[PDB]
């Protein structure tokens, strides 16, 4: 299954959900790349919540 | 990742690397362990392949 | 416990059961004539700066309007641009669309209708999508209407198709800013009465709730588009009565092409500016070399009929002795007019004028209400 | 006439000049034209007040044709019988026809209305304890029948086998028999709790047909014709749920019996313990006081020495008074002993469900005597435009016969001519090109040919599966499953197996290579196998029907005869004498003259326990 | 079963819609009326080799 993530969708996720942007700042420049971070987030319980 | 089906007798997981390609053998005893390890490792190689594709496009 | 098939036959043929019909049409016509009796010489803003906001959302993909909503609005906007620049030449106009939550300005505020026609034709090809933003369109129009001079009235026409809008900020602050800038907004809605559009129209039009219009069918949309070409009557509190400086250019004749001052292209004809001797392609436009309006006498003449509109002609009484058996303007014989057997000359088609008392038929009456704007009898009177 | 002066332009009209009827002043609102010669009614659909007359005509008249603009109806006796039965009195019909017609209603038409409508409902056939009694409310009607006296308030018992003769004789006399089942007031037959499931929706045309059947509150025996895939089986289920009596259903194939059992157990609240099947494998009957039994025409009408179990089941069927019979594919009822299934079974109500109500002989006109009047006609264009059935593009490809093939066509007998005009190489090329083109479009294609040798030759030449009579059943199922699911198999070649009732996957293209003479029934049955496609919900979808015929042969005559029924339904067969892509297709079957000559010569080549061991 | 995400820059995605338009064009070819059905083939030459 494939889902399309536009850049504007990423910005809307950051604006509507500051918790995701907080997880974006301390992980993506540090440990893993941005698509890996989003694939981890979409399979996490945080996305379901 | 080459995986064995549940109908087969021996459970073993084959790993294929990239640049001669490196090949590794991972045999297991229990079928639930194979299921969990293959879904976790398939998810992480899917994430890494998506990251590599995004880096190659950029 | 029964069944639908066991019921008695519908017998719809047996359900069908089979003069003064002209009276039944003419009472509705008189109600139409009664609505035209409110004739007043209200002061209207001739010089207008109209901003046409056209929806280009997902609700524009609805097929309640033939063939889709978006194409019909674009075509009727083309017709509206043609009619508006035919009746209001001095007035300028810009076109904004709301697409994907953003206000896209597709033609700058200019007096040339051809650019707006080309812009609307270009927008007709694209597919509407997105969730419309009223606040973005209002802010873009506010930015567009900011350099408009005080004598030129600031009007916005919003053709809103959707029922809900998503804004990036508080739309009430935008409404208050538009009220503070004397910008009048008229909204034509497609589906139902949206409360924010009604509030915006009421605030911008000094409490007048009649500027929010919703269609009923195809022809009602045509009538609502044709209603907006008339200049809006201004309020008494508006004191922007300023003299406007313009010159009347002369159509230069030359067999040698010359560079125009507006487009820098080779045009044979033109209009030399009476102030700075610079030529332009078309009229009425600002002079590109000295920022002066350049109009003709006909451009002023097109908007005089709003300033002195004719009083509507009165239906003649049936018992009143008619002056002429035929018409006065076109000498058409008024018919026997017997709607029923003993009708005699009931609802006689003569329309008495209020000054010259001349008789006009219904064809002449609707022709003076549409194409002409002067009563022939009032001019034939030796005053 | 009305003293009308004959014009010189009325010379070639064979007494059909109806200009003596004075035109009404308010005629333009009235959409009808009544012809006094034969009761034919001309309706204009485009005028106002057309549907409010269209329902009146479909209640009181039989539609000859229903094209787009002008509809043509027939006032007949049987239509008037159903008209008065559903509650339309005689004066109401005359008053409405007078009100809704431009020309005045002629006195001959009015007298026909009075004559056909009166003397109806006098003689009635009732069944009491598996015994047929003909009953009349008036005494002297018994004494005026002295010719066909088969006697064995005022009623006398007739024999069970002689009921058809009585119905024919009373139809010849001005007293037609009334066949209505008052199931509401019938208490001798035990009721059933059969009822439709609430999840099952019924289409409005099916509701209209059942309102024609159950108009007066009493079940009326008759015939209902619907297109294939329009849900005639559901109409049968709903009729059984309406009557709520013991139901016997007759079919033509055992697979049809299985399908009818499946449809009964799915759409309505009938337990499997109330359902019984009388086939070769299954012969167990329901043990309850009432229920459903489904069987085949052949086993019920078997004159041969049947088995003991089948004899016991037949005795159970005959000794039980049935409240309802559903005859699927009623066009085969007028056969020799398929006629007798209405005599061997005492059924109060008889509903004949069909799709192809035509036969090449006149015995298709005997079903009003056997089952009852033709209750409902489905408008196939009206169902196609509403998406209930597919919008087929009927066509007829003209394949010219080659020089060496046509020479042999004329110096041959008709039986060999039949084989020879099928196998012309231009028909091979046309069929191959159509298969390639419609396979590139992604269409499931059925190629019908009644000739077995032609079917095999076409399939071997084109590399496609073929199904005919001698194919094993498991191979047929495997081929059909590959046709339904495998995308590499989009074309199946079917013989007359596909014409009769077998289950097929959904197909959108049909190519008719050959045919069984002028069988209109087979033509409409073949068209019915592409009329129920799944893609009907798709906008702009059209199914395709090709009848590949050899030019200047007798196949043209039979093809026109077969198409004569479908043009009555409204289908237009556009001729195709040219196919764009003939010269540019990669492979042409029999393109070289030597290959055509080889094909021609191949077609012509077709025509004491101890002494027992020594013996 | 397995999850895949697509990080898009929103410039290629429009072209992706054009690709969908290509599929829509294929949907026009699947439902296309054949050339012998839309017009009369009488004036053309007869079918053959
Ligand atoms: Zn210029
Ligand atoms: Zn100037
Ligand atoms: Zn006049
Ligand atoms: Zn006047």
Curated annotation (Swiss-Prot), chain A:
Domain spans labelled BSD? 1-49
The subcellular localization recorded is: Nucleus
Q: Family assignment?
A: Belongs to the TFB1 family.
Task performed by this protein: Component of the general transcription and DNA repair factor IIH (TFIIH) core complex, which is involved in general and transcription-coupled nucleotide excision repair (NER) of damaged DNA and, when complexed to TFIIK, in RNA transcription by RNA polymerase II. In NER, TFIIH acts by opening DNA around the lesion to allow the excision of the damaged oligonucleotide and its replacement by a new DNA fragment. In transcription, TFIIH has an essential role in transcription initiation.
Something else the entry says is:
Present with 5150 molecules/cell in log phase SD medium.
Subunit structure of this entry? Component of the 7-subunit TFIIH core complex composed of XPB/SSL2, XPD/RAD3, SSL1, TFB1, TFB2, TFB4 and TFB5, which is active in NER. The core complex associates with the 3-subunit CTD-kinase module TFIIK composed of CCL1, KIN28 and TFB3 to form the 10-subunit holoenzyme (holo-TFIIH) active in transcription. An additionnal subunit, TFB6, plays a role in the dissociation of the SSL2 helicase from TFIIH after transcription initiation. TFB1 interacts with XPC/RAD4. XPC/RAD4 recruits TFIIH to the NER machinery. Interacts with the NER 3'-endonuclease XPG/RAD2.
Protein name as annotated = General transcription and DNA repair factor IIH subunit TFB1
Q: Which gene encodes it?
A: TFB1
Q: Which residues of the full protein are shown?
A: 247 to 295 of 642
Swiss-Prot record, chain B:
**Residue ranges the record marks as coiled coil:** none
Record's subcellular location: Nucleus
**Which top-rank group of organisms is this from?**
Eukaryota
Subunit and partners:
Component of the 7-subunit TFIIH core complex composed of XPB/SSL2, XPD/RAD3, SSL1, TFB1, TFB2, TFB4 and TFB5, which is active in NER. The core complex associates with the 3-subunit CTD-kinase module TFIIK composed of CCL1, KIN28 and TFB3 to form the 10-subunit holoenzyme (holo-TFIIH) active in transcription. An additionnal subunit, TFB6, plays a role in the dissociation of the SSL2 helicase from TFIIH after transcription initiation. TFB1 interacts with XPC/RAD4. XPC/RAD4 recruits TFIIH to the NER machinery. Interacts with the NER 3'-endonuclease XPG/RAD2.
The family line of this record is: Belongs to the TFB1 family.
Additional detail: Present with 5150 molecules/cell in log phase SD medium.
Record function comment: Component of the general transcription and DNA repair factor IIH (TFIIH) core complex, which is involved in general and transcription-coupled nucleotide excision repair (NER) of damaged DNA and, when complexed to TFIIK, in RNA transcription by RNA polymerase II. In NER, TFIIH acts by opening DNA around the lesion to allow the excision of the damaged oligonucleotide and its replacement by a new DNA fragment. In transcription, TFIIH has an essential role in transcription initiation.
- The name of this protein is General transcription and DNA repair factor IIH subunit TFB1
What range of the full-length protein does this chain span? 48 to 121 of 642
From Swiss-Prot, chain C:
Instruction: Give the main localization category.
Output: nucleus
Keyword DNA damage listed: yes
Residue ranges of domain VWFA in the record: 49-228
A biological process (GO) of this protein is: transcription initiation at RNA polymerase II promoter
Any one GO CC term of this protein is: transcription factor TFIIH core complex
Localization terms from the record: Nucleus
Question: Could you cite one Gene Ontology molecular function of this protein?
Answer: zinc ion binding
* Keywords, alphabetical: DNA damage, DNA repair, Metal-binding, Nucleus, Transcription, Transcription regulation, Zinc, Zinc-finger
Record-stated family:
Belongs to the GTF2H2 family.
Q: What else is known?
A: Present with 2340 molecules/cell in log phase SD medium.
Instruction: Spell out the subunit comment.
Output: Component of the 7-subunit TFIIH core complex composed of XPB/SSL2, XPD/RAD3, SSL1, TFB1, TFB2, TFB4 and TFB5, which is active in NER. The core complex associates with the 3-subunit CTD-kinase module TFIIK composed of CCL1, KIN28 and TFB3 to form the 10-subunit holoenzyme (holo-TFIIH) active in transcription. An additionnal subunit, TFB6, plays a role in the dissociation of the SSL2 helicase from TFIIH after transcription initiation.
Function recorded in the entry: Component of the general transcription and DNA repair factor IIH (TFIIH) core complex, which is involved in general and transcription-coupled nucleotide excision repair (NER) of damaged DNA and, when complexed to TFIIK, in RNA transcription by RNA polymerase II. In NER, TFIIH acts by opening DNA around the lesion to allow the excision of the damaged oligonucleotide and its replacement by a new DNA fragment. In transcription, TFIIH has an essential role in transcription initiation.
From Swiss-Prot, chain D:
Q: Where does ATP bind?
A: 226-233
Tell me the CDD domains matching this sequence. DEXHc_XPB, SF2_C_XPB
Q: What happens when the gene is disrupted?
A: Essential, it cannot be deleted; epistasis studies suggest it is involved in damaged DNA excision repair.
Cofactor(s) for this protein?
Mg(2+)
InterPro entries the record matches: ATP-dep_DNA_Helicase, ERCC3_RAD25_C, Helicase/UvrB_N, Helicase_ATP-bd, Helicase_C-like, P-loop_NTPase, XPB/Ssl2, XPB/Ssl2_N
GO MF terms held by the record: 3'-5' DNA helicase activity; ATP binding; ATP hydrolysis activity; DNA binding; DNA helicase activity; DNA translocase activity
Enzymatic reactions: Couples ATP hydrolysis with the unwinding of duplex DNA by translocating in the 3'-5' direction; ATP + H2O = ADP + phosphate + H(+)
Going by the entry's taxonomy, the superkingdom of the source organism is recorded as Eukaryota
- Per the record, residues carrying Phosphoserine are 592
In terms of pH, how does activity behave? Answer: Optimum pH is 7.25 for helicase and ATPase activities.
One Gene Ontology term of the biological-process aspect is: regulation of mitotic recombination
Annotated Helicase ATP-binding domain residues: 213-375
NCBIfam families attached to this UniProt entry:
rad25
| Cited function | ATP-dependent DNA translocase. Component of the general transcription and DNA repair factor IIH (TFIIH) core complex. When complexed to CDK-activating kinase (CAK), involved in RNA transcription by RNA polymerase II. May have 3'-5' helicase activity alone, the TFIIH core however has no 3'-5' helicase activity. Also involved in transcription-coupled nucleotide excision repair (NER) of damaged DNA. In NER, TFIIH acts by opening DNA around the lesion to allow the excision of the damaged oligonucleotide and its replacement by a new DNA fragment.
- Organism the protein comes from: Saccharomyces cerevisiae (strain ATCC 204508 / S288c)
- Gene name, please? SSL2
């Amino acid at each position: 299954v494939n889902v399309n993530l536009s850049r504007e969708k990423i910005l809307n996720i950051f604006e509507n959900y500051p918790i995701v942007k907080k997880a974006y700042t301390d992980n993506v420049p540090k440990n893993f790349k941005e698509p890996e971070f989003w694939a981890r987030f979409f399979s996490s319980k945080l996305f379901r919540k | 990742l080459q995986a064995t089906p549940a109908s087969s007798e021996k459970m073993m997981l084959r790993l294929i690397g990239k640049v001669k390609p490196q090949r590794h053998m991972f045999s297991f005893n229990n079928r639930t362990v194979m299921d969990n390890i293959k879904m976790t490792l398939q998810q992480i190689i899917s994430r890494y392949k998506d990251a590599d594709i995004y880096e190659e496009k950029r | 416990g029964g069944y639908a098939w066991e019921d008695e036959i519908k017998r719809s043929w047996d359900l069908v059961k089979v003069m003064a019909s002209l009276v039944a049409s003419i009472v509705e016509a008189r109600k139409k004539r009664t609505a035209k009796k409110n004739i007043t010489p209200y002061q209207r803003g001739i010089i207008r700066s109209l901003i046409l906001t056209l929806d280009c959302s997902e609700a524009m993909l609805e097929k309640d309007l033939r063939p889709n909503r978006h194409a019909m609005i674009i075509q009727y906007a083309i017709d509206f641009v043609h009619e508006f620049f035919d009746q209001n030449p001095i007035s300028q106009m810009g076109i904004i669309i709301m697409r994907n939550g953003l206000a896209q300005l597709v033609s700058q505020v200019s007096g040339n209708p051809q650019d707006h026609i080309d812009a609307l034709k270009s927008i007709r090809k694209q597919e509407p999508k997105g969730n419309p933003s009223l606040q973005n369109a209002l802010e873009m129009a506010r930015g567009l209407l900011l350099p408009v001079p005080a004598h030129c009235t600031r009007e916005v026409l919003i053709v809103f198709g959707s029922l809900s809008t998503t804004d990036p900020g508080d739309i009430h602050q935008t409404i208050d800013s538009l009220v503070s800038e004397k910008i009048r907004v008229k909204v034509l809605g497609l589906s139902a009465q949206v409360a924010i559009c009604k509030e915006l129209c009421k605030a911008t039009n000094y409490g007048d709730e009649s500027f929010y219009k919703i269609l009923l069918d195809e022809t009602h949309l045509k009538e609502l588009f044709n209603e907006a070409v008339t200049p809006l009557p201004v309020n008494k509190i508006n004191k922007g009565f300023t003299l406007v400086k313009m010159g009347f250019p002369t159509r230069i004749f030359e067999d040698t092409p010359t560079f125009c001052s507006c487009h820098s292209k080779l045009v044979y004809g033109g209009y030399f500016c009476p102030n700075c001797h610079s030529k332009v392609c078309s009229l009425p436009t600002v002079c590109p070399c000295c920022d002066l309006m350049l109009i003709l006498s006909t451009h002023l003449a097109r908007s005089y009929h709003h300033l002195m509109p004719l009083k509507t002609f009165a239906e003649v009484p049936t018992t009143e002795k008619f002056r002429s058996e035929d018409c006065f303007s076109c000498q058409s014989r008024f018919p026997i007019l017997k709607n029923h057997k003993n009708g005699k000359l009931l609802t006689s088609s003569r329309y008495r004028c209020e000054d010259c008392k001349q008789e006009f038929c219904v064809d002449c009456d609707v022709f003076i209400h549409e194409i002409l704007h002067n009563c022939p009898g009032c001019e034939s009177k030796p005053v | 006439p009305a003293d009308f002066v004959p014009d010189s332009v009325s010379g070639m009209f064979r007494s059909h000049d109806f200009s003596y009827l004075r035109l009404r002043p308010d005629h333009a609102s009235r959409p009808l034209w009544i012809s006094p010669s034969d009761g034919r009614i001309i309706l204009e659909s485009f005028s106002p007040l057309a549907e409010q007359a269209q329902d009146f005509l479909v209640t009181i008249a039989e539609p000859i044709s229903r094209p787009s603009h002008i509809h043509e109806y027939k006032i007949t006796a049987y239509s008037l019988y159903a008209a008065v039965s559903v509650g339309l009195e005689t004066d109401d019909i005359i008053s409405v026809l007078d009100r809704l017609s431009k020309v005045p209603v002629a006195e001959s038409i009015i007298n026909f209305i009075k004559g056909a409508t009166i003397s109806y409902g006098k003689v009635k056939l009732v069944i009491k304890h598996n015994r047929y009694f003909v009953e009349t409310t008036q005494a002297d009607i018994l004494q005026m029948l002295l010719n066909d006296s088969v006697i064995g308030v005022h009623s006398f018992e007739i024999a069970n086998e002689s009921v058809e003769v009585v119905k024919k004789r009373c139809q010849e006399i001005d007293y037609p028999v009334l066949e209505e089942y008052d199931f509401r007031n019938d208490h001798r037959n035990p009721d059933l709790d059969i009822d439709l499931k609430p999840s099952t929706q019924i289409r409005p045309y099916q509701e209209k047909s059942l309102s024609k059947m159950f108009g007066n509150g009493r079940a009326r025996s008759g015939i209902i014709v619907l297109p294939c895939g329009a849900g005639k089986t559901l109409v049968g289920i709903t009729a059984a749920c309406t009557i709520k009596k013991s139901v016997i259903v007759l079919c033509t194939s055992s697979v049809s019996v299985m399908q009818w059992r499946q449809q009964f157990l799915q759409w309505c609240t009938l337990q499997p313990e109330n359902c019984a099947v009388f086939t070769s494998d299954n012969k167990e009957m329901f043990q309850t006081e009432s229920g459903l039994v489904v069987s085949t025409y052949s086993m019920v009408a078997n004159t041969r020495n049947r088995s003991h179990d089948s004899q016991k089941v037949m005795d159970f069927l005959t000794g039980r008074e049935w409240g309802f019979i559903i005859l699927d594919e009623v066009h085969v009822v007028p056969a020799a002993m398929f006629r007798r299934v209405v005599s061997t079974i005492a059924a109060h109500a008889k509903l004949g469900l069909t799709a192809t109500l035509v036969r090449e002989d006149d015995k298709i006109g005997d079903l009003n005597f056997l089952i009852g009047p033709k209750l409902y006609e489905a408008n196939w264009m009206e169902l196609s435009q509403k998406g209930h059935i597919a919008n087929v593009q009927c066509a007829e490809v003209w394949c010219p016969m080659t020089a060496e093939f046509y020479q042999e066509y004329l110096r041959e007998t008709a039986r060999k001519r039949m084989l020879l005009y099928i196998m012309n190489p231009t028909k091979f090329q046309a069929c191959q090109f159509l298969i390639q083109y419609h396979e590139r479009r992604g269409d499931k294609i059925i190629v019908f040919s009644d000739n077995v040798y032609a079917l095999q030759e076409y399939a071997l030449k084109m590399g496609k599966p073929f199904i005919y009579g001698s194919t094993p059943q498991q191979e047929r199922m495997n081929i059909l499953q590959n046709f339904q699911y495998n995308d590499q198999i989009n074309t199946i070649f079917l013989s007359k197996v596909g014409d009769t009732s077998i289950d097929l996957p959904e197909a959108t293209c049909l190519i008719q290579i050959s045919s069984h003479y002028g069988s209109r029934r087979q033509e409409a049955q073949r068209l019915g196998r592409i009329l129920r496609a799944k893609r009907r919900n798709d906008e702009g979808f059209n199914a395709f029907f090709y009848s590949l015929v050899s030019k200047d042969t007798q196949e043209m005559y039979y093809s026109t005869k077969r198409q004569a029924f479908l043009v009555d339904q409204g289908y237009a067969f556009k001729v195709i004498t040219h196919l764009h892509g003939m010269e540019n297709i990669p492979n042409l079957a029999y393109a070289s003259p030597r290959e055509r000559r080889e094909l021609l010569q191949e077609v012509l080549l077709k025509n004491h326990p101890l002494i027992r061991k020594m013996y | 079963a397995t999850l895949h995400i697509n990080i898009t820059t929103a410039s290629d995605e429009v072209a992706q819609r054009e690709l969908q338009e290509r599929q829509a064009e294929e949907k026009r070819k699947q439902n296309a009326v054949p050339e012998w059905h839309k017009q009369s083939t009488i004036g053309k030459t007869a079918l053959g080799r």
